[PDB]
A paper describes a structure:
For example, the main chain atoms of Phe255 form two hydrogen bonds with the Watson–Crick face of the U11 base. The RNA stem is closed by a Watson–Crick base pair (C8–G15 in the hexaloop SL RNA). The G9 base does not form a base pair with A14 but rather the A14 base packs into the minor groove of the RNA duplex. This arrangement provides an extended stacking interaction of G9, U10 and Tyr250 in the ROQ domain at the 5′-side of the RNA stem.
The Roquin protein is essential in T cells for the prevention of autoimmune disease. We have recently reported structural and functional data of the Roquin-1 ROQ domain bound to a canonical constitutive decay element (CDE), a short stem loop (SL) that acts as a cis-regulatory RNA element in the 3′-untranslated regions (3′-UTRs) of target genes such as Tnf. The ROQ domain adopts an extended winged helix fold that engages predominantly non-sequence-specific protein–RNA contacts and mainly recognizes the shape of the canonical Tnf CDE RNA. Here we present structural and functional evidence for a greatly expanded repertoire of RNA elements that are regulated by Roquin as demonstrated with a novel U-rich hexaloop SL in the 3′-UTR of Ox40 bound to the Roquin-1 ROQ domain.
Residue numbers in the entry: 178 to 325
The structure:
Amino acid sequence: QLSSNLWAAVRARGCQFLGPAMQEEALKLVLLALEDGSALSRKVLVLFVVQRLEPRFPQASKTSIGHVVQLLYRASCFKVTKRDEDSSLMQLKEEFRTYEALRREHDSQIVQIAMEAGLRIAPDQWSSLLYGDQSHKSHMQSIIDKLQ
RNA sequence: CCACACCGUUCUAGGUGCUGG
């Protein structure tokens, strides 16, 4: 029940959480594409991630991965180079080119959406929802403290 | 509402499907 309201608010903003293991791998594949400073269109980044993710996770799609990318878009993780007529190119901002930096920004964004939706979720519940364990308790509390 | 897909959102944001369930 505590999942349902959170994931509905996440999806209402064009975002998605695919699950602890799947979201982690998805974000690490974004790093594989963008850690070296490559400027990829949204289409190409999504095509890059989906290909590498669907062997481990068959349900991965252009649509569901696009929703993960949007979460990082909303969290301001990209340098966006707009172009006339054509589609924009996206690079990872230099400060989010490691997993823990990107993941902090990603997690913070989900917590912001939860706060904007009027939901109250404790750090232990957050650790379960985002990591499938209770070993990220202080990590989530730290994120909540900075948002408040 | 869900899925799929397209266009847009870094001036921050969602839209469109005369796609499917």
